[PDB]
Design an enzyme around this catalytic site. Structure first.
Site, PDB file in Angstrom:
ATOM      1  N   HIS A 196       0.983  -1.200   0.092  1.00 42.96           N
ATOM      2  CA  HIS A 196      -0.089   0.036   0.135  1.00 42.96           C
ATOM      3  C   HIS A 196       0.860   1.228  -0.024  1.00 42.96           C
ATOM      4  CE1 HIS A 196      -3.440  -2.564   0.756  1.00 42.96           C
ATOM      5  NE2 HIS A 196      -4.232  -1.498   0.694  1.00 42.96           N
ATOM      6  N   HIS A 238      -3.456   2.477  -4.274  1.00 38.72           N
ATOM      7  CA  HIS A 238      -3.687   3.708  -4.154  1.00 38.72           C
ATOM      8  C   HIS A 238      -2.729   4.125  -5.152  1.00 38.72           C
ATOM      9  CE1 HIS A 238      -6.324   3.098  -0.456  1.00 38.72           C
ATOM     10  NE2 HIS A 238      -5.567   1.742  -0.591  1.00 38.72           N
TER      11      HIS A 238
HETATM   12 ZN    ZN Z   1      -6.602  -1.141   1.203  1.00 45.96          ZN
END
Ligand code: ZN
Ligand code: N4X
Ligand code: N4X
Ligand code: ZN
Ligand code: ZN
Lengths: 572, 562, 388
Positions: B388, B410
């Protein structure tokens, strides 16, 4: 209770009284016009508006109006013939005491509309939507309503969510949600429909436009079409029935190209057993006269007005003449207007316009033209049906998606609810009235994004915040949606894009049921025994999930705004 | 073919050659840094990017090229080689033997050097702060946007026609992968709340402090239900994230048994394991003595299973469906410590502070890289690192991933890092974005940079961070596409390109991917795309490949001219 | 030389030839429907458009154009090509901004202050202070102030200063033309007070004088249809954004639009939504004007303030401003002698040859892109018709 935003001072409206009165008097008159035409049609008017309108009114005004239901097709049991004469004069349908030349015929004294009166009320309203001083006052008061909402959420959002946390059983996934604007023909898979169409052509030998679909319903026995369209809707009925809390108001098409259409449709409902406790039918009259006349299929617009509204009058008088239509109309709640609202209008609907019997040119009648003669014939039909204890009908047109803003003047007078309504953002006068009258606007922001107004520009957030009775619906449940739960997908894109609270979501769901054509009995189960009661006393969080704090804010804000207009007219 | 937007003259870069040369040299240096750590990790590096790099390098580049859980018989598993394992300065070292032998010699694995890493980090950390290079990168990113606008304005209809000449394929008949979905989020709060029959912390302890018999049987059904819901869909697959916290060495063995007992295996579900970055919490309770203990509880069971399959029987089976590692924690949390050579080592980290993000990532990368080298020799399945990164916090988090991560999730902070976004494009690094979840917490939906990353040509894909939250329907991946397809008004090429990106950014086998996207999906450019399976016209793939090659050439030619 | 965006392939217009000619036929026709009306009315027609139009050699024409503006399939061709013009400019600036600024610096003799500018839409009644009111005196200082400004000139309207020229106005409810000035938000209920389409018809061919009207501010979108036939330059123009076809014709005809972004914010539009930047990017002839020199402006250099607010809000470059200043003089009602000095003896030459950066401050690169962009677009519209 909740933090209450109180505007203490002199110019509590924010304008000098000399400017409040001018807008107030016009607004009161405009609200009276709607009240008059809603009473004539046996349609609904906002009780809160009426209670405040009865103070400046000179004339009293008030609200005075298991087995498979289609399985028992016995004309013997149905109410019998009344021997009434049905003839259309100058568009409107008149009812007469006798049905034959054998006996003397006397016109039944129904409140037959006067077109001269309508062409006068329209011109009064059409002058109020272009008055700068009043359009400014309405814009300011509209902006105040949004500001009041923002302060309410800021100072009371957590009080609302605490109430929702209490009563845990009720959540947006188990509250009643009605799809208030879905077209049934769009519930078909274009790929699968072409497959069925391709095989049927070979059956007669043994992408698909809405025009090719119209002709099949008008030029075929519907033995093959009525089975493909019956399974699809029935599956939608079953899917909507597993989701106990999701209900649909599907739109069926009556084109007015033949007088057997209504009978042909009631057979499909009864033959194939197409009824659901969640599905309620509204019938759409596609405004395609220009195409029919140019094909030499209809000689007069009155022929279309007759092929649509006479099979209904006949079944209200002699139910056994149209046995299926008598039972199919107990599940039909109103009529709708459908067409490309972008199309330009070259003709104004005034007293110098051809009447339905004189409209023989290939031109298409204006939008108000379709709306006025749908309102007139519907109003008489409801007046006749009420006496026999039958089902009253409503007018819910596709108004505001595009085209001239004057379309919203027509619906402000003759329509109980509208669909879309995207052009009220450009009409401060109309939006103020649509709020003060609590007119239902069933919006489909997703379909609007791909064709007209982008999701960013859609005015649904502003209508909902200011207090307009807005609801969310799927226009086409398969073209603008990728999930198998299009109504939920509609609530998601709107909830996320505009970041809406649970109270905001549940308020729309409640607004989806209060503007729907459902029984008082089912609504009582859905929203509680006292749903009819106005204000917080009509809200039960155990059934709505909407805090009484929000219901209090909406009710109080509407009452205060109505009082501002009424009190000003009382001080002149 | 399609309309081709071409530039004429000498200043095709739009800036003075000195600016191009200054930027190109640093960009190429950064691209070599990633290529080095990918080869050392047995991870993937963009083939087209490598080809351009080989022409500016004096050495060749090192990057080139029934029910499984039914019967568990260790006697059929591969043999034990007797290798010895020890963790030295963070990394795990494999030794010739564990018992008294002639020589317990260190196995010559390419063990990382921290000093080289810090030097490489500090070069990039200065590259993402250079104004001249930042301006050059910003302009080229804008150019990629304009070029895409020309392509759609001039070839949108050509593309749409091709998608219609193959009606057998549509968005519903193309394979799609949910590239960033957390398994623990596949559970209903209310159903699990009453499952006690009387939040992540409680769930963590229900996996470490107990046999996980009631817990596993319950979490297994809720995940195996999702498996069938995907198998029925046929064309929707997911890469679910399970948690190995590192508080005990029994976690890995526990998780494998849960999968082999409740047979939580699907052909559409590939496992990735996330290590939550919660050392400070564990240390403040006294459950871990040194951070090296956490790194030991995560990698020692894996190394032992790699050398001695029968030592960890279920793990040898559960690891053929585990594809890599992930790092999870609130990336908004402030960071006080920098990862330099002056920082405490895993065995010395006895304080209650939480090691920085690069500290977590470097040692996850280092131990993983050695594990992949050993497993490659054994013929076992290699792993990948897909953290992440970019959701929030400092921009420097993206420098760590550019070096050590094959994919990122992301990636919202590249919008404020012109050089990094330019590097992620030229490196073609996956970015599994979840716009719906981002709207609720961090960045507004309309300001999410997914349209810009996709238009400019970054390997972006759509995913559901939390399936049952933020999504009101029961097809959450589709709902994610719908909001993105409508809010940003995207086409079928845009949608079907994201789908192909989702599959090319996944850990699914070559065999399955060949079935999904075509036998020659490994090929670079239009030759690897069949419209009969992807629904993406070769017009779009041609524009992407041409734009990338041309951009790589502008950087390469500038460096060559010196 | 400058970097050039070269499209290569088949549908270089973005549509198949069937849709190209279906709209090139109507576009070619409408362009003729203006030359003839400009030919009779003694008004001016664009040279470059006429050159290509030649190779292809009232109410009835109004109906034809009114049908075209609504033609949806055609309205999609114009929009696609309009956006292509906005995109081509973005690539042009990205890859040539650095050199254009350097070219502008290569001749420091000319700056935005040394170039000549013309206020193409100011109202004389608005030059006076209402408090001072509670005639020639005010205009005398305005003329004197303009005369004090060597490189600043204007065109006033009355309902000799060499820097001021007159264009009389006639409410719809030395001198060089006329304008129809009235609140354009007033709805029209009769189809031709006398409707907007009425006044222009009789004001059109009386002519020499040229009809430069107040068209496009608000109200009906058809006003621009009348102006495209019965106007040389127009004021405001805020409604061409709502009509893709009209803007595609206004661009290809190089019609002059005198915009007042500052005043539009007060009433009929917002500064963010004003289409001036989009018009200028696509190549439409846009000039900056001050509808009221004192109501909306807070400074003693209102036109400079008008140029400043637009330059800062939309982040315009030196070329953008100087390109606008030249557009002001070129569409101004002045003589070849006047523009032989303000713009140069070669100002009649169309394209790069007519540009003298030593007198306009606009590099030849910008002029090259603008001229090249228009010629190719007309060639697409015309060469499609030629080989039908
Ligand atoms: Zn997540
Ligand atoms: C127009 C419509 C689609 C929908 N409809 C009404 N009343 O709107 C209807 C109702 C009963 C039978 C057929 C139809 N059809 C025709 C049709 C159905 C199925 C396949 C082909 C054609
Ligand atoms: C942490 C998690 C939720 C998910 N998980 C891993 N490895 O992430 C896991 C795996 C095997 C057994 C239990 C779990 N649990 C604990 C649990 C399951 C069911 C109910 C309550 C608690
Ligand atoms: Zn609709
Ligand atoms: Zn003016």
């Amino acid at each position: 209770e909740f933090q209450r935003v109180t505007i203490s001072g002199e110019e509590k409206c924010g304008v000098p009284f000399t400017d409040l009165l001018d807008a107030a008097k016009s607004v009161v008159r405009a609200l009276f016009i709607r009240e008059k035409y809603m009473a004539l049609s046996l349609q609904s008017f906002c009780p809160t508006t009426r209670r405040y309108l009865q103070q400046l009114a000179e004339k009293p005004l008030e609200t005075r109006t298991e087995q498979h239901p289609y399985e028992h097709c016995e004309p013997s049991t149905m109410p019998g013939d009344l021997g009434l004469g049905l003839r259309m004069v100058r568009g409107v349908v008149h009812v007469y005491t006798r049905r034959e030349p054998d006996e003397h015929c006397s016109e039944v004294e129904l409140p037959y509309p006067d077109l001269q009166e309508f062409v006068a009320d329209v011109n009064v309203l059409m002058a109020l939507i272009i008055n700068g001083p009043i359009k400014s006052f309405c814009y300011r008061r509209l902006q105040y309503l949004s500001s009041k909402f923002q302060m309410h959420v800021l100072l009371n959002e957590m009080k609302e969510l605490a109430a929702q946390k209490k009563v845990p059983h009720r959540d947006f996934y188990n509250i009643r949600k009605v799809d208030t604007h879905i077209h049934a023909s769009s519930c078909m898979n274009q790929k699968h429909l072409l497959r069925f169409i391709k095989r049927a052509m070979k059956r007669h030998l043994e992408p698909i436009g809405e025009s090719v679909l119209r002709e099949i319903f008008i030029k075929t026995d519907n033995r093959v079409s009525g089975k493909y369209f019956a399974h699809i809707i029935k599956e939608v009925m079953s899917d909507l029935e597993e989701s106990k809390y999701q209900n649909a108001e599907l739109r069926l098409s009556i084109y007015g190209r033949s007088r057997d259409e209504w009978d042909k449709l009631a057979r499909w409902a009864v033959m194939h057993r197409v009824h659901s406790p969640n599905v309620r039918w509204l019938v759409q009259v596609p405004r395609l006269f220009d195409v029919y006349r140019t094909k030499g299929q209809l000689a007069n617009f009155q022929e279309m007005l007759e092929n649509i509204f006479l099979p209904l009058f006949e079944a209200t008088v002699h139910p056994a003449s149209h046995p299926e239509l008598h039972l199919f109309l107990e599940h039909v709640d109103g009529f709708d207007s459908v067409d490309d609202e972008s199309k330009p209008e070259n003709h104004v609907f005034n007293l110098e316009s051809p009447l339905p019997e004189a409209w023989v040119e290939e031109d298409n009648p204006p939008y108000a033209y379709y709306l006025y003669y749908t309102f007139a014939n519907m109003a008489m039909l409801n007046h006749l049906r009420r006496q026999r204890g039958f089902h009253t009908f409503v007018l819910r047109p596709h108004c505001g998606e595009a085209g001239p803003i004057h379309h919203l003047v027509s619906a402000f007078m003759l329509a109980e609810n509208i669909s879309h309504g995207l052009l009220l953002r450009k009409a401060p006068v109309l939006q103020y009235l649509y709020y003060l009258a609590q007119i239902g606007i069933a919006m489909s922001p997703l379909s609007n994004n791909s064709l007209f107004l982008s999701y960013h520009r859609n005015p649904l957030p502003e209508y909902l915040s200011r207090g307009l009775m807005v609801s969310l619906s799927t226009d086409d449940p398969l073209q603008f949606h990728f999930t198998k739960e299009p109504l939920m997908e509609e609530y998601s894109i709107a909830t996320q894009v505009w970041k809406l609270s649970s109270c905001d979501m549940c308020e729309l769901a409640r607004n989806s049921v209060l503007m729907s054509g459902f029984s008082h009995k089912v609504k009582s189960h859905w929203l509680g025994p006292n749903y009819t009661k106005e204000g917080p006393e009509g809200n039960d969080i155990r059934r709505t999930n909407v805090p009484d704090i929000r219901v209090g804010y909406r009710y109080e804000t509407l009452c205060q705004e109505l009082a501002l207009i009424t009190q000003a007219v009382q001080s002149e």
